[PDB]
Write a protein that binds this ligand. Structure first.
Ligand SMILES: Nc1ncnc2c1ncn2[C@@H]1O[C@H](COP(=O)(O)OP(=O)(O)OP(=O)(O)O)[C@@H](O)[C@H]1O
Ligand SMILES: [Mg+2]
Lengths: 115, 173, 458, 85
């Protein structure tokens, strides 16, 4: 169930308003229906009043105000391990080559602390 | 200060009250809305960064003497922009616009001692022709002026006090 | 009566009842933990809010603290009771001795003397320093400014000026340390006490460790003491350890006061803030003030607004160059930028004027030739150009002088040089009498006879 | 008619349970780049250590009229608006 709604779209910067008890943390990943494709948004700043400010990981064109936003509670997660070898992927870990789905065994968050 | 931001809300509210011939009720509602804003716990609530709709719905809860169809709309409109603190100034500008619409002017009179009714009558009669509006005088005689009288309407001031003459004379130095 | 409503660094906002709003520059008082904190009013905001600068550490201040309104500005002790003691910006004693036996206290914010009261004087004040009194002599009751970067030697020159000038001046003196090293203040105080001259000097110290308010207002206290000594009809000497820190403190506090930045991020009121302070340091028909001020130059940029504004307020300006100091030539005075109002044939006389202008022209020609020398080498020069270079280098060496205060660095004993000896030596060098001597003969010699004596042993 | 409506206001706020936060406690209003804006904390002082959820601290730098500006002495990404401090 989507819980947030878009309130501003200024270029790549997208603002989304969430219920006050469900505001996503920083660096979390959101997704929205940009027509016929899912568009992922990365949370950058938590503004007051439940409004969050995000950077769109894709083309921002075609976004309407009021679109529903699904709050994935984990940061951007990518497949890892031996399955990735010989494969071309974008920042989101989706295959860019036409060689089909990656036989992932794990997905790891990209934002982690240093040793 | 909220003087500049209060103006559109006061003007809209006054025009609406004029179109519905309910100005007095609106003035009372505005006074009530201005009083709840001064509440100590409500002040902290208004200072906090609550969502506009939740803050609005919490504000409507503390008011049961508001005309909901119009007063709730007013409050929700101010809430959506965070202007709720401007209510004490919206009230004052509403009163000012009402007085302008009714062509009525308040005048303050200051003198060394209480005036006679005939002097007050002549003052009111002169001021009504000066302003071309009806006037309502109030007397606020003062301990410091030892003679003369001061007449203030709007911000135009006529000074005949002896204190003013004494200072204006020393200025020729 | 007052309530604190905001705390932003050194700036504290206080709310008062609208009938009792304190005036500008009024001193406020607030209890901060186990100590009493003074606040100075800067701006009157609307609705009884007043904006103040804390004369102390502002940490530990809560909102809602009760603030007491004192009805007078910051007032400091003045008079002979301040002689020989170290005093805080607030006029409190900082030495461990007892309370100051004050008889009168003065507000630190005062108006400049009127145009009528001003007095002109041309009595040349002699110094032991060849380059200073040669190129940029200064008169009793005038302003002297030492411009330099970091480490070029402003403080050493000021200490040597103190030592030399105090010889023929028997009046009182005021030393105001603004935003400098505390260690230097302690050393100066101890060396004053050891010489038993402390009882003639009043010392006001607000150093760099202090919060911005102390560094901002400290100079005015020293100025007020100097003005008290002056109005009594005496001849006073004022020394400001670093005038630059005052404007720096103004810059630090300016942003919090809600003023838009200007130029290089300085406060918009930079020129007025500098002028109001500088205008009070003036000799008057009732009494004279001699002033020496060190002026820090940020990042060696002599075009920065802070040095640029100071240039107009001074009578004699001595510019210290890092490049010369790196040669080991001390004092590192740049003779092509140093200038004084007193370098005028009427006052100094014709011989001094001609010698100074000859030296200036020779050095200018050397600067012009140096660009060719850098690429082609000296061999390409004409035979007169080579003589010009040889004389210019000797002049540059001769400007060096061993200081008595620098003995802890060089080891060699200091020298005192009369004006007559320096003008005679420089005129002799330019006339070519000493063209047979090597350059090293002139390095760090007091007088020309010492130069010829050094030549015998090379 | 003013004192009675004022006490009616107090009665109504009591009825609907709108109440101020306790002193020495507050709520995080916004989070960005390790800077934290906190509402409440009426008894906070300049330079105080503010204990956050978990076992980390924030340093109060600004005591604004309506909020406290603080910097987190550690990772800030897990903090969220509305957390108690
Ligand atoms: N006559 C001199 N002989 C030898 N060295 C000197 C002489 N005058 C100055 N110096 C050198 O100048 C150096 C720095 O001097 P000083 O402390 O006065 O600098 P300053 O310009 O006041 O610097 P700051 O900006 O750090 O306060 C000393 O380490 C010293 O070696
Ligand atoms: Mg120094």
């Amino acid at each position: 169930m989507a819980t947030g709604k878009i309130v501003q779209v200024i270029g790549a910067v997208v603002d989304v308003e969430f219920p006050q008890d469900a505001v996503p943390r920083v660096y979390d990943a959101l997704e929205v229906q940009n027509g016929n494709e899912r568009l992922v948004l990365e949370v950058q700043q938590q503004l007051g009043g439940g409004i969050v400010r995000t950077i769109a990981m894709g083309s921002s064109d075609g976004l309407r105000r009021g679109l529903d936003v699904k709050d994935l509670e984990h940061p951007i997660e990518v497949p890892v391990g031996k399955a990735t070898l010989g494969r071309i992927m974008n920042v989101l870990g989706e295959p860019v080559d036409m060689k089909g789905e990656i036989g992932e065994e794990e997905r790891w968050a990209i934002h982690r602390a240093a040793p | 200060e909220f003087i500049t931001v209060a103006r559109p809300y006061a003007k809209a509210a006054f025009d609406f009250a004029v179109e519905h011939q309910s100005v007095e009720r609106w003035q009372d509602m505005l006074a009530f809305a201005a009083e709840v804003t001064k509440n100590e716990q409500m002040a902290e609530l208004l200072s906090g960064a609550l969502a506009p709709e939740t803050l609005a719905e919490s504000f409507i809860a503390v008011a049961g003497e508001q005309l909901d169809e119009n007063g709730q709309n007013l409050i929700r409109v101010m809430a959506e922009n965070g202007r709720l603190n401007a209510l004490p100034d919206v009230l004052e500008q509403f009163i000012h616009l009402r007085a302008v619409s009714e062509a009525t002017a308040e005048v303050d009179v200051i003198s060394a001692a209480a005036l006679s009714e005939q002097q007050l009558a002549k003052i009111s009669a002169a001021m009504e022709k000066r302003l071309s509006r009806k006037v309502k005088l109030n007397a606020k005689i003062d301990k410091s002026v030892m003679a003369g009288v001061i007449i203030r309407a709007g911000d135009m001031v006529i000074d005949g006090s002896v204190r003013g003459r004494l200072e204006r004379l020393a200025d020729v130095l | 009566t007052g309530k604190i409503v905001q705390v932003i660094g050194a700036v504290v906002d206080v709310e008062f009842p609208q009938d009792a709003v304190p005036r500008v520059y009024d001193a406020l008082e607030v209890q901060n933990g186990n100590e009493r904190l003074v606040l100075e009013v800067q701006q009157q905001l609307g609705g009884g809010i007043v904006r103040t600068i804390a004369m102390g550490s502002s940490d530990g201040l809560r909102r809602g603290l009760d603030v007491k309104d004192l009805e007078h500005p910051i007032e400091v002790p003045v008079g002979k009771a301040t002689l020989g003691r170290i005093m805080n910006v607030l006029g409190e004693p900082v030495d461990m001795k007892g309370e100051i036996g004050e008889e009168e206290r003065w507000a630190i914010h005062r108006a400049a003397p009127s145009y009528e009261e001003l007095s002109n004087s041309q009595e040349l004040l002699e110094t032991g320093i060849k380059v200073i009194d040669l190129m940029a002599p200064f008169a009793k009751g005038g302003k002297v400014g030492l411009f330099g970067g970091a480490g070029v030697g402003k403080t050493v020159n000021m200490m040597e000026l103190i030592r030399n000038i105090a010889i023929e001046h028997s009046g009182y003196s005021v030393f105001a340390g603004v935003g400098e090293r505390t260690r230097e203040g302690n050393d100066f105080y101890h060396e004053m006490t050891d010489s038993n001259v402390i009882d003639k000097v009043s010392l006001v110290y607000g150093q760099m460790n202090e919060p911005p308010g102390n560094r901002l207002r400290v100079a005015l206290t020293g100025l007020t003491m100097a003005e008290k000594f002056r109005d009594e009809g005496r001849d006073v000497l004022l020394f400001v350890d670093n005038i630059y820190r005052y404007t720096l403190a103004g810059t630090e506090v300016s942003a919090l006061l809600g003023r838009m930045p200007s130029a290089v991020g300085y406060q918009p009121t930079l020129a007025e803030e500098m002028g109001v302070l500088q205008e009070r340091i003036t000799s008057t028909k009732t009494g004279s003030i001699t002033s020496v001020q060190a002026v820090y130059v940020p990042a060696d940029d002599l075009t920065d607004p802070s040095p640029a504004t100071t240039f107009a307020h001074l009578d004699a300006t001595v510019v210290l160059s890092r490049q010369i100091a790196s040669l080991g030539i001390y004092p590192a005075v740049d003779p092509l930028d140093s200038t004084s109002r007193q370098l005028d044939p009427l006052v100094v006389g014709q011989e001094h004027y001609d010698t100074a202008r000859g030296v200036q022209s020779i050095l200018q020609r050397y600067q012009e030739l140096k660009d060719i020398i850098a690429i082609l080498g000296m061999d390409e020069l004409s035979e007169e150009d080579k003589l010009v270079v040889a004389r210019a280098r000797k002049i540059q060496r001769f400007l060096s002088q061993p200081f008595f205060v620098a003995e802890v660095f060089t080891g060699s004993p200091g020298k005192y040089v009369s004006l007559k000896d320096t003008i005679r030596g420089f005129k002799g060098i330019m006339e070519g009498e000493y063209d047979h001597l090597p350059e090293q003969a002139f390095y760090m010699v007091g007088s020309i006879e010492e130069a010829v004596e050094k030549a015998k042993k090379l | 008619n003013s004192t009675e409506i004022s006490e009616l206001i107090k009665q109504r706020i009591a009825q609907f349970n709108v109440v101020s936060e306790a002193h020495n406690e507050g709520t995080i209003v916004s989070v960005s780049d390790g800077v934290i804006r906190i509402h409440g904390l009426a008894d906070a002082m300049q330079g105080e250590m503010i204990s956050l959820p978990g076992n980390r601290y924030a340093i109060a730098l600004n005591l604004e009229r309506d909020s406290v500006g603080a910097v987190v002495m550690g990772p800030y990404a897990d903090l969220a608006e509305g957390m108690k401090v």
